[PDB]
Amino acid sequence: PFIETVKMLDARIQTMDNQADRFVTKEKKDLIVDSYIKWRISDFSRYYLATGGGDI
Amino acid sequence: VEMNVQYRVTNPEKYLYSVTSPDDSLRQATDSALRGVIGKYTMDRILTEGRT
């Protein structure tokens, strides 16, 4: 009764990227890189309290 | 040369009832560590391979 809070721990969002990051070759040459990361929640139990809060 | 650090607390009671004023100790030892690393290497090498 008293208070209803269940924040749904979504299992849908898999979109994360790095806007612009720098790296280095062996040949002492600069080369900017960009990539995107895709990831799915797998086992929920450890995942929660593996972060304490579901805040992405 | 300049850098930046990211830090995280695990055991709160050591964060409280130990050396006081945390950011003071953190920053004011990081400077010494940065001197320790930067010292031994030559000017050109610091110019070129600063990131690895």
Swiss-Prot record, chain A:
It is found in: Cell inner membrane. It comes from the Bacteria. Disulfide bonds: none annotated. HflC and HflK interact to form a complex, originally called HflA, now called HflKC. HflKC interacts with FtsH; complex formation is stimulated by ATP, and with YccA. Integration of this protein into the membrane depends on SecA, SecY and SecD but not on SecB or FtsY. HflC is unstable in the absence of HflK. HflC and HflK help govern the stability of phage lambda cII protein, and thereby control the lysogenization frequency of phage lambda. HflKC inhibits the SecY-degrading activity of FtsH, possibly helping quality control of integral membrane proteins. Belongs to the band 7/mec-2 family. HflC subfamily. This is Modulator of FtsH protease HflC. It comes from Escherichia coli (strain K12). The chain holds residues 57 to 112 of 334 of the full protein.
Swiss-Prot record, chain B:
The gene is hflK. HflC and HflK help govern the stability of phage lambda cII protein, and thereby control the lysogenization frequency of phage lambda. HflKC inhibits the SecY-degrading activity of FtsH, possibly helping quality control of integral membrane proteins. It comes from Escherichia coli (strain K12). Belongs to the band 7/mec-2 family. HflK subfamily. It is found in: Cell inner membrane. Disulfide bonds: none annotated. The chain holds residues 159 to 210 of 419 of the full protein. HflC and HflK interact to form a complex, originally called HflA, now called HflKC. HflKC interacts with FtsH; complex formation is stimulated by ATP, and with YccA. Integration of this protein into the membrane depends on SecA, SecY and SecD but not on SecB or FtsY. HflK is unstable in the absence of HflC. This is Modulator of FtsH protease HflK. Signal peptide: none annotated.
